[PDB]
Amino acid sequence: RTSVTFHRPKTLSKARDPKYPRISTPGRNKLDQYQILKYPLTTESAMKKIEDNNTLVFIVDLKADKKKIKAAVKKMYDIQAKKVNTLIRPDGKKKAYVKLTPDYDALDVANKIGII
């Protein structure tokens, strides 16, 4: 040996392959789109945002992030979000402002579900 210092020799670690699964039942996706998008908001402030800013206001799950909101609005309503802005409301629910890419029309999206 040249070094005076004895280090820990490195050995093999074998990976896990258990003889029975600790979980048989699969995972349901409990935050699916209907959990993510609960219901659109119909406050007069929101109805302004539809015309003036091409925007849609939803009440969303408290555990949904901006990315999943973008995905779920494409599966449901088959549209595109240019930008999603969120805030957790003073009473505990999360509100998402969805801006549609300028292809789609927010008013026509508003009509196809019924808000205006």
Partner 1 sequence: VKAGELWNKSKDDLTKQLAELKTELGQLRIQKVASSGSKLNRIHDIRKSIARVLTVINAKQRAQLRLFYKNKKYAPLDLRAKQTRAIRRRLSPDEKSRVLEKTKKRTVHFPQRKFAIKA
Partner 2 sequence: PSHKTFRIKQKLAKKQRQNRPIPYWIRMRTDNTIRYNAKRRHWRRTKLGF
Partner RNA sequence: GCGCGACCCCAGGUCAGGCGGGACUACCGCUGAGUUUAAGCAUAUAAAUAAGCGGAGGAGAAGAAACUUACAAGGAUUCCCCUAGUAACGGCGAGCGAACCGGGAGCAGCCCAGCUUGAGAAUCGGGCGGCUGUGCCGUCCGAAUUGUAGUCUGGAGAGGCG
Partner RNA sequence: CGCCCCACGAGGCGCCGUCAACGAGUCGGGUUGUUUGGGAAUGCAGCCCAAAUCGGGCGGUAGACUCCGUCCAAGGCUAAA
Partner RNA sequence: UCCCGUGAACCAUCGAGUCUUUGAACGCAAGUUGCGCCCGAGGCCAUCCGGCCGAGGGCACGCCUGCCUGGGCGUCACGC
Q: Which residues bind RNA (CB under 7 A)?
A: 8-9, 11-20, 22-23, 25-31, 62-63, 67-68
Largest Cα–Cα separation, the chain: 83
Nearer to partner 1, 8 or 22 (CB): 22
102 binds, among partner 2, RNA, partner 1, none (CB under 5 to 8 A by kind): none
Q: Which of 59, 55, 34 is nearest to 110 (CA)?
A: 55
CB 79 within 8 A of CB 109: yes
Give the interface segment with partner 1, choosing from 18-26, 49-57, 85-93, 101-109 (CB under 8 A).
18-26
Distance CA(95)–CA(78), nearest Å, equals 20
Binding flags for partner 1, 77-116, as an x/- string (CB under 8 A):
------------------------------------xxx-
Distance CA(27)–CA(37), nearest Å, equals 20
Taking CB under 8 A as the criterion, the residue among 21, 92, 102, 114 binding partner 2 is 92
Residue whose entry in the numeric block shows the structure tokens 């019924």? 114
The answer to the question of residue 88 lying near partner 2 (CB under 8 A) is yes
